[PDB]
């Protein structure tokens, strides 16, 4: 299962962003198909609840090559916001987890993709979005 993770991390700018990837420690396009070779770390697509997306091919077969082969992509449209980190350490978004311009959908990598949200307050959310009851946490101001 863990093989479905794009680890094309090349810290060329020497910024050391990978440090916060492994442990915990400041001043709008829709989600489609994204290649895994330009992704470093897990991909989190944000429905009402945060869902982790794995590495597959063009058809959806789960590939276990760590995103090394060019046939590895992420089908963000099949989970219909999504965020991910690129090879050089940039939070590439599409639609991300900002349901409210003041809040943010919490997930195990909220502080790594959005470091300026550490001082945010968590809240318990319950709502029937499309008939399905989703339970998740937010991060407002």
């Amino acid at each position: 299962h863990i093989n479905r993770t794009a680890l094309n991390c090349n810290d060329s700018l020497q910024t050391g962003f990978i440090t916060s990837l492994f442990y915990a420690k400041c001043p709008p396009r829709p989600c489609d198909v994204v290649s895994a070779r330009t992704v470093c770390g897990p991909v989190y697509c944000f429905t009402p609840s945060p869902v982790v997306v794995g590495t597959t091919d063009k058809l959806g077969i789960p590939t276990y090559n760590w995103g090394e082969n060019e046939t590895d992509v992420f089908m963000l449209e099949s989970l219909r916001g999504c965020t991910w980190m690129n090879s050089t350490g940039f939070t590439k978004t599409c639609g991300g987890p900002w349901i409210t311009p003041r809040c943010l959908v919490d997930y195990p990598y909220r502080l790594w993709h959005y470091p300026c949200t550490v001082n945010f307050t968590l809240h318990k959310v319950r709502m029937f979005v499309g008939g399905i009851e989703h339970r998740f946490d937010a991060a407002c101001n």
Partner: antibody
Amino acid sequence: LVQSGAEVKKPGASVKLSCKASGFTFRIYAISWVRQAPGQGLEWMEIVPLGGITNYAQNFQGRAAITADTSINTAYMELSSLRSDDTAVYYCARVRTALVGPREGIFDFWGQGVLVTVSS
Amino acid sequence: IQMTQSPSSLSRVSITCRASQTISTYLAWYQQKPGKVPKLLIYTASTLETGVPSRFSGSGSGTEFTLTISSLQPEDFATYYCQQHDSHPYSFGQGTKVEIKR
């Protein structure tokens, strides 16, 4: 996961300690080293995945240098400028990561343990 | 960051592990027998490691944590160390020696 052999060296020298990895991914899990003096507690001398992340302890940050070099998943360990109190058994343990591990980093599996004696 | 265990020597019984700074439940416990390798028991103060007997329980949060054991089997008399795995540097404590009584 197997360490190197027991070594005995005189003070003011350097010791190279090796390790290995089998049955898990080397990039994800970090590889740590633990010191235990004879008849005393466990010392936290630290970790390095092949992603290039290293964070030593305050006391050992000067002379301890842990390099990954994932050629055959070695995770070497070189400790220069030895002293009499450095006589202790050294371990090569797997510390977890916030990627696959449930928390920041836990020593779920440990090494056989290599004895290093420093005396003139 | 500093750690300290309350029971120096031990002879149902529990072991204490107090920190100097506050930690929101990120402590691990370990068992080491004299001559063998340390073994993980609990890795987040509450959840025990898979394969550890259910008689090994853990409670506590914040500055003080506890390792609660009820049944004392012959395979349990050893030294027990607690580890802090919240922030760097990771730090252990002076292990408590659980000795037999006769």
